[PDB]
Amino acid sequence: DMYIERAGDITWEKDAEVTGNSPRLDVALDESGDFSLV
Amino acid sequence: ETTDGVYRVMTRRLLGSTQVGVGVMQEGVFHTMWHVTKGAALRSGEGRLDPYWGDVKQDLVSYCGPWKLDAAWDGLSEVQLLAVPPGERAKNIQTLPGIFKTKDGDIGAVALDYPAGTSGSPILDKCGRVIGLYGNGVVIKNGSYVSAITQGKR
Ligand SMILES: N=C(N)N[C@@H]1CCCCNC(=O)[C@H](CCCCN)NC(=O)[C@H](CCCCN)NC(=O)[C@@H](Cc2ccccc2)CNC(=O)CNC(=O)CNC1=O
Numbered sequence: 001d002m003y004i005e006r007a008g009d010i011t012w013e014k015d016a017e018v019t020g021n022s023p024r025l026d027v028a029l030d031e032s033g034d035f036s037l038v
Numbered sequence: 039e040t041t042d043g044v045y046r047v048m049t050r051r052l053l054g055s056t057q058v059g060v061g062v063m064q065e066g067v068f069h070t071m072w073h074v075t076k077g078a079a080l081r082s083g084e085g086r087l088d089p090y091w092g093d094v095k096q097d098l099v100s101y102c103g104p105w106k107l108d109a110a111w112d113g114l115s116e117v118q119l120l121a122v123p124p125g126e127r128a129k130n131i132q133t134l135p136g137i138f139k140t141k142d143g144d145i146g147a148v149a150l151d152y153p154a155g156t157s158g159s160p161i162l163d164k165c166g167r168v169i170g171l172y173g174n175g176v177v178i179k180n181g182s183y184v185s186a187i188t189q190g191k192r
Pocket residue numbers: 032033034035036073097151152153154155156157172173174175176177181182183
C-alpha cells in the first residue's frame with residue numbers, strides 16, 4: 001500500500017547547479033513502454 | 039484538498055520505508071509514472087487517491103482527475119530537473135536537454151543519473167511549468183543514463 005509525502009514546491013531555482021550533456025540519440029519505444037537505442 | 043507540489047511515493051511493503059518514486063500534485067490531480075505505482079491506489083495521509091487515467095506505453099498515470107500538465111520543452115532553453123532522490127532533500131539541477139529521435143518524432147531528454155526511486159521527478163522550464171517527468175530512459179554506449187522528458191496529453 002503506497003503513500004505520498006510532500007517534498008517541495010515546484011519552482012525554478014536561480015542559483016541552481018548546471019550539469020549534464022545534451023546527447024542526440026535514435027531510440028525506439030515499444031508497446032511495453034521501454035526505450036531502446038536503435 | 040491536497041497541496042500543490044512535488045511528492046515522494048513511498049511503500050512499506052518492502053524492508054522499512056522505501057521510496058519507489060516521485061510525483062506532481064497540480065490542479066487537484068497527482069501525476070507520476072506508470073512503472074512507479076502500476077496503477078495502484080495511493081493514500082495521502084488519511085485519504086485515498088484513486089487512479090483516473092494511465093498508459094503503459096507512455097509510462098504515465100494520473101490520480102483524482104485527468105492529466106493536467108501540458109507545458110513542453112521549447113527545443114532551445116535549459117531546463118531544471120527537480121530531483122527528489124530517496125532519503126535526500128529535493129534539489130534542482132539545470133541542464134540543456136538532448137534529444138530522443140524516434141519514428142514518431144523527437145522529444146527532449148535529460149542526461150542525469152539518479153536512483154530508481156527518483157522516477158517521477160518533474161522537469162521544469164524557466165517559468166516553473168512542468169514540461170514532463172523523469173525516469174523512463176536508456177543507457178548509451180559509454181554507460182551513462184539518459185531519461186526522456188516524458189509529458190502527457192491534456
Ligand atoms: N545507470 C543506470 N542504469 N541508471 C538508472 C537510472 C534510473 C532512473 C529512474 N528510472 C527507472 O528506474 C527506470 C525504471 C524502468 C522504466 C522502464 N520503462 N529504469 C530505466 O529507465 C533504466 C533503463 C531501461 C532501458 C530499457 N530498454 N533501467 C535500468 O537502469 C535497469 C537496468 C538496465 C540497464 C540497461 C538496460 C536494461 C536494464 C535497472 N537498474 C539497474 O539494474 C542498476 N541501476 C540502478 O539500480 C540505479 N540506476 C538506474 O536504475
